[PDB]
């Protein structure tokens, strides 16, 4: 079941807060 | 003619059953609402039939109240020639 694509979905592997620039360059 | 003089007094007198509900079951059988006083007589004739059964089932409940049961409807409809059925299968 770990073989399921849901585990490899970008949302599962991506942290949203790190993604946000928050006006940071 | 009393019944002609009675129906001419039915532009007022909203009966107990609405004409949107009495007229629905009349339209289901082909009777269309030409005159709204005609509906109110059929709604009155259907009230009087149900009221005469509930008034005669009360006499069969005073001997044995304030509660309408199937063993009160059974002798009340038996003089009408109607054999009512218990559910017995639920």
């Amino acid at each position: 079941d770990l073989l399921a694509d849901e585990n490899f979905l970008m949302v599962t592997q991506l942290h949203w807060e790190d993604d946000i620039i928050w006006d940071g360059e | 003619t009393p019944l002609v003089d009675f129906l001419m007094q039915l532009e007022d007198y909203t009966p107990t059953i609405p004409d949107a509900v009495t007229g629905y079951y009349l339209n289901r059988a082909g009777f269309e609402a030409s005159d709204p006083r005609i509906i109110r007589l059929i709604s009155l004739a259907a009230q009087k039939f149900i009221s005469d059964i509930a008034n005669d089932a009360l006499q069969h409940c005073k001997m044995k109240k304030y509660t309408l049961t199937m063993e009160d409807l059974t002798p009340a409809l038996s003089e009408y020639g109607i054999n009512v059925k218990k559910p017995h299968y639920f």
């Binding site: - | 339209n27 289901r28 059988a29 082909g30 009777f31 269309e32």
Partner: protein, 487 residues
């Protein structure tokens, strides 16, 4: 009962209930099955092996049952294959004799055609100049009508009934796409105008007398601007209205219902005119003649009656079916009436003499859809097995078989040219079949060894959104109309 064919499964479960004698003495379908003879068309090459196993006295009793209850109709030819025998069986008293399908049938159109009947064979109605003016604007519609064919596939305009919480049981459209009737389970017929022209009736009896009288605009005057709706509801049936049929002059709606009456509604006064009480039983279908005087109604009492809108009693009783006459369709010359039925047979009936001139067997379920070719040479039938069987009326054999549909095929129509047969079923699909490549090839043996041409004849499938296709209509400019209640 286990070693029977799979298409007899609904036939055996009526027999599993029948265990007593008095249960069968009031069935009237197995009572007529016990007295009739199964026809059982077999070849002479296989009958010689059968009669060499039955004429000997070792068996001597199953041979007695065969020669008592079974006819055997022998043809001289090849023994048929199993998928060809499967195509032409499935009916009680099945596979009728070739001596029934050899009568002369006038399957041609009226006005030379040698297959056409004379005009004075059936006493039809008369025509006037106004009728020649109709065919002038009819061929203007035929212009925009395109030889549909397998390339220019037609556009389908679905006229869905949206709410329809009373169950829609009958649809008809006029020959010009101007009115749509709806027969419903709440015992009503509802006429809708689809052109931008409201339905108008004369408001009062006094109004028609004063108007016209040399005004020269009778059609404009009869319509009254006080009664003008996009919908007229017709009351008077005491039961769900199962048949709906317009007259070709766009008056005279017909409707039949569960209460056993056929009703003739006017479309100029929008009232009921006549109630035709000949059945005591649910009349499952009715249709006007394409010339508009006679009409045929088939009911639960296993007959189809021929009426004339002038007599309270019928003229012809077509009484040879063993189950309910589900469908009743007129020929395009109106000398012949096709009656499909629930005993899996389709029968053509001559209007003269009331004789059955053709018997078409080969359906596995009750026939629910019937349609004639505009040539008059062919007949498409549909039933609950999802099969559309194309019959040659002169040949009287299976010709083609269209087996794309899954559930009951409840509507068939050919194109106005004859180029495409449209099929609508309870699978919520409108399939289009090539009705030219199906009849391209068209005896002494009673069959033609029909192929599996269904894949080649399919042109499109057109799945509908949860909506069974109750009616199919072809506009005179070859546009498909369809009308099903949305469930």
């Amino acid at each position: 009962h286990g070693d029977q064919e799979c298409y007899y499964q609904d036939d055996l479960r009526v027999l599993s209930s029948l265990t007593k004698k008095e249960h069968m003495k009031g069935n009237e379908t197995m009572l007529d099955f016990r007295t009739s003879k199964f026809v059982l068309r077999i070849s002479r090459d296989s009958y010689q092996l059968l009669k060499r196993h039955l004429q000997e006295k070792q068996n001597n009793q199953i041979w007695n049952i065969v020669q008592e209850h079974l006819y055997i109709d022998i043809f001289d030819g090849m023994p048929r294959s199993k998928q060809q025998i499967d195509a032409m069986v499935g009916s009680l008293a099945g596979e009728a004799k070739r001596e029934a399908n050899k009568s002369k049938v006038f399957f041609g159109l009226l006005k030379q055609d040698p297959n056409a009947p004379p005009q004075n064979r059936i006493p039809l109605p008369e025509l006037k100049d106004s009728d020649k003016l109709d065919k002038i604007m009819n061929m203007k519609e035929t212009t925009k009508r395109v030889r549909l064919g397998p390339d220019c596939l037609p556009s389908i305009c679905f006229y869905t009934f949206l709410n329809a919480y009373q169950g829609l049981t009958a649809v008809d459209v006029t020959d010009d796409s101007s009115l749509i009737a709806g027969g419903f389970a709440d015992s009503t017929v509802r006429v809708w105008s689809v052109t931008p022209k409201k339905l108008r009736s004369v408001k009062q009896a006094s109004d028609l007398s004063l108007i016209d009288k040399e005004s020269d605009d009778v059609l404009e005057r009869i319509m009254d601007e006080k009664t003008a709706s996009e919908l007229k509801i017709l009351y008077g049936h005491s039961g769900p209205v199962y048949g709906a049929s317009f007259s070709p002059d766009r008056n005279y709606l017909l409707s039949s219902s569960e209460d056993g009456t056929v009703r003739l509604w006017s479309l100029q006064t929008f009232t009921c005119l006549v109630g035709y009480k000949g059945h005591n039983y649910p009349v499952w279908d009715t249709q006007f003649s394409p010339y508009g005087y006679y009409f045929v109604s088939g009911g639960h009492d296993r007959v189809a009656r021929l009426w004339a809108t002038d007599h309270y009693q019928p003229l012809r009783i077509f009484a040879g079916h063993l189950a309910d006459v589900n469908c009743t369709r007129f020929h395009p010359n109106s000398n012949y009436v096709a009656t499909g039925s629930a005993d899996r047979t389709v029968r053509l009936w001559d209007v003269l003499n009331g004789n059955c001139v053709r018997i078409f067997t080969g359906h596995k379920g009750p026939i629910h859809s019937l349609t004639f070719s505009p040539n008059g040479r062919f007949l498409a039938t549909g039933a609950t097995d999802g099969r559309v069987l194309l019959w040659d009326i002169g040949h009287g054999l299976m010709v083609g078989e269209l087996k794309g549909h899954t559930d009951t095929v409840c509507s068939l129509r050919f194109s106005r040219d004859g180029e495409i047969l449209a099929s609508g079923s309870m699978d919520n699909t409108v399939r289009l079949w090539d009705a030219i490549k199906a009849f391209e090839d068209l005896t002494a043996t009673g069959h033609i060894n029909l192929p599996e041409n269904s894949q080649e004849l399919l042109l499109g499938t057109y799945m509908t959104k949860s909506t069974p296709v109750v009616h199919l209509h072809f506009t005179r400019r070859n546009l498909v109309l369809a009308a099903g209640a949305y469930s």
